Amino acid sequence: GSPLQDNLVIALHSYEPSHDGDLGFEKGEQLRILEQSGEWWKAQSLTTGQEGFIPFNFVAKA
Amino acid sequence: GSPLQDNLVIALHSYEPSHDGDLGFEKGEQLRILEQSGEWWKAQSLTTGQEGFIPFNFVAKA
Numbered sequence: 721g722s723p724l725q726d727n728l729v730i731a732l733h734s735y736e737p738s739h740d741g742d743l744g745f746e747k748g749e750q751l752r753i754l755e756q757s758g759e760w761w762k763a764q765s766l767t768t769g770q771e772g773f774i775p776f777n778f779v780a781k782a
Numbered sequence: 783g784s785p786l787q788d789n790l791v792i793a794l795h796s797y798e799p800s801h802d803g804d805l806g807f808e809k810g811e812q813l814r815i816l817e818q819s820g821e822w823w824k825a826q827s828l829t830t831g832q833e834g835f836i837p838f839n840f841v842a843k844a
């Protein structure tokens with residue numbers, strides 16, 4: 721399928737960043753994963769379009 | 783040893799909470815773990831004395 725395949729997640733919990741370049745999100749927000757190595761994934765919000773690093777346990781693939 | 787044994791952690795990354803009852807902390811802050819089941823652990827900051835739930839990947843046992 722498309723490039724979104726294995727690369728869409730839903731936030732399980734809200735996240736407020738505390739480090740420049742980290743991305744916040746609301747619970748239930750959908751994000752596109754750009755890079756998924758280590759415990760901080762590069763993502764793009766499908767709500768705001770903004771990009772940055774997210775804590776991987778706060779989201780689930782769907 | 784003492785009850786602190788297996789129950790002290792150091793924050794690997796800062797955390798800003800976004801849910802009542804969740805506990806924020808600075809990078810390098812030391813916390814006492816009160817409960818360590820699931821991915822949200824009940825903790826007490828050894829900086830502020832405050833208690834609440836923390837995301838377990840943000841800390842490391844020491």
Ligand SMILES: [Ca+2]
Nearest residue numbers: 776777778821
């Ligand atoms: Ca998990």
Ligand SMILES: [Ca+2]
Nearest residue numbers: 759838839840
């Ligand atoms: Ca970890």
Ligand SMILES: [Zn+2]
Nearest residue numbers: 739742773795
């Ligand atoms: Zn960070």
Ligand SMILES: [Zn+2]
Nearest residue numbers: 733801804835
């Ligand atoms: Zn919470």
